[PDB]
Amino acid sequence: CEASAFIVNGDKEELFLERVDKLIPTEEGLLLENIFGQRKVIKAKIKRLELVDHRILLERE
Amino acid sequence: CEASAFIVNGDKEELFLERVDKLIPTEEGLLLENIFGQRKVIKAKIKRLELVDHRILLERE
């Protein structure tokens, strides 16, 4: 199943995109596409995937 | 949901670890832990996540 992506700044988490299907690193940033076909790009690295708990944790660069 | 990780070498795909739960980028490589508690480290980057299809695609170095 689709997992939610969050931006993590220290102890703060902000929801970035729900129900992410694809995550594709590009030269412009991480490109995320959710199950409804909505796309968002973010200059970030993956801090961690926690897939049982439906979480993609991203940190801005 | 948990995803299987595959190594993509050119056009070839090779199963690396089944049902991955955690994926944590480290200085020594991507640390993967599956739902059975099995752990593996690999010097690789994420080519792409396909979370609906339960796939993590990795490329070495």
DSSP chain B: --EEEEEEETTEEEEEEEEEEEEEEETTEEEEEETTS-EEEE-EEEEEEETTTTEEEEEE-
Q: How many domains are there within chain A?
A: 1
Tokens of A9: 């700044």
Q: How many Å apart are CA B4 and CA B21, to the nearest integer? A: 9
Residue range of the domain that includes B21? 1-61
Q: How many CB pairs under 8 A join A and B?
A: 56
Strands B3-9 and A44-50: unpaired
Buried b or exposed e, range B13-47, using 16+ CB within 10 angstroms: eeebbebbbbbbbeeebbebbbeeeeeeebebebe
* Residue B60 near residue B43 (C-beta atoms within 8 A): yes
Residue A56 backbone phi and psi in degrees, to 5: -115, 115
* Residue B2 near residue A49 (C-beta atoms within 8 A): no
* Residue B31 near residue B41 (C-beta atoms within 8 A): yes
Asked if B3 lies within 8 A of A51 by C-beta distance, the reply is yes
Asked if A51 lies within 8 A of B2 by C-beta distance, the reply is yes
